[model samples]
Target chain A: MGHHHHHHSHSKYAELLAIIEELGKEIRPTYAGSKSAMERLKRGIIHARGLVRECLAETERNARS
Target chain B: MGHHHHHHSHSKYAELLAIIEELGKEIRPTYAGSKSAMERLKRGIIHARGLVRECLAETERNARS
Candidate 1:
């Protein structure tokens, strides 16, 4: 079975949270209910920014188009 | 000042969208207001899943803690 999931956080948002964990080295907890969750969200946003700087030109291009 | 932003999507969601750009080499189009924007979201979630598989053990550790 696919790794079973839980909704300790919001249900559909679980996947997004997991992704954030990878980015933030935990989580930044930006808009979280707890401090630990805050840390994870922070880490995630930082990591993706590095990736984003690379990709958003594509977004900008599309936007301008 | 930071890069100026617009809420063609949601306003606060800008950073998340930028990061998503890096992942899929484009957007994935998950829950977007437009097809171009949609492409970006899909690409983003896919890239992070790879990162997430790595981080969620850390996440699991926290959830169990």
Candidate 2:
């Protein structure tokens, strides 16, 4: 819960938020041990990282305009 | 990296993906050592979780449509 100056409505980002949460569930301490699952999720996350960078660029554009 | 079957573009999720990635950077093994940073990020993430769940519901809606 953040109460800063900007009323950031992050609902637009919900889709990616969901993906990260799925990954987060995997990375949970006791649950992060499945071999096959790791590779799949890791790959997804890495790919997601590129998307994140692009988003950062676009985020600035959105903010700039 | 993962090219199984579905053409998962995932570009739509970039904004939330960026937030997760930012939090992820905080979570890197050696670099995750800041009290102030953790609380802010942790709070943001927890809030993000609710957004993720909503996205999941809406994802199904979008899919169902």
Candidate 3:
């Protein structure tokens, strides 16, 4: 099951993306194939960050109410 | 800025640690002390997951209100 996941925005995504980019640079020597996979990985990182943002927004609302 | 950072717990951390352990196993041949670092990393991952759980709880409260 998906569990009781709530909403979020893209607010905290910048931090996550920065971490992802650092990871890429760290692993660049080991990974193979074209640069597109790196781009794809970066996009995926952003997508996950967006979900985390949604969670952050949801948390804000809960604290207020 | 303080922003809207919310709460979390340690619920989903097991899964995160599983992934970290897998990474540790996979890289064992190449890296020295990777296991220990991996363990520390797993602990950190669990901590982050706890925060995410706190976020989820806050999100749920927000949704109901």
Candidate 4:
């Protein structure tokens, strides 16, 4: 009984994405409390996405060039 | 002699979005450091976004009902 099914890909990006998704799940339920909190969370999250998007784009550009 | 131009719209969602954008900008440049750090930041940011997106969707649903 020493076999747990973990179909894992060892890519760093994949690992990073998985961890991020986990964090996302953890934070999701907390937003149901108040409008102010939700708003704040939204702002922070959106900002993060923007940052990630920018970095990803830059990385891609760097890789291609 | 103190007047900074601010958008007069006091909508909560708009305000939240604006603040989040600011945070995003703050975090963006930090990702250019190392692969490990970038991976960690990406995970955290992605997680945050997932949380925010879920909350946003739920809030919208609540508003409609």
Clashes of each: 27, 0, 11, 3
The i-RMS of every model, in angstroms, reads 13.3, 8.5, 9.5, 14.6
Task: Label model 4 with its docking quality class.
Answer: incorrect
Whichever of 1 and 2 has more lDDT, that candidate is 2
Off by over 4 Å in 1: A7-65, B2-34, B59-64
lDDT of 4 by residue, A1-65 (tens): 72242333332223333434443442333323344533444454554445444434554465443
Q: After superposition on all CA atoms, what RMSD does each candidate show versus the true structure?
A: 14.4, 10.9, 10.1, 16.6
For candidate 3, lDDT tens digit of each residue in B29-61?
223334454344334434444545554465456
- Let me know the DockQ for model 1: 0.06
| Real interface contacts reproduced by model 4, as a fraction | 0.16
**In model 1, what lDDT does residue A5 have?**
53
lDDT for every model? Answer: 0.44, 0.47, 0.41, 0.41
| Candidate 1, residue B55: lDDT | 42
lDDT for B42 in candidate 3 is 38
Question: Per-residue CA lDDT of candidate 2, range A1-65, in tens?
Answer: 74432122343344355455555554442132455544444554565566455555654455532
Name model 3 segments beyond 4 Å from true.
A1-65, B1-33
DockQ-based ranking, best first?
Answer: 2, 3, 4, 1
Candidate 2: RMSD over Cα atoms?
10.9
Residue-by-residue lDDT tens digits, candidate 1, B1-65: 75574544322134455555453332222222345643443445555554444444554675553
Per-model TM values vs. the true structure: 0.30, 0.38, 0.32, 0.29
TM-score of chain A of each: 0.37, 0.51, 0.44, 0.48
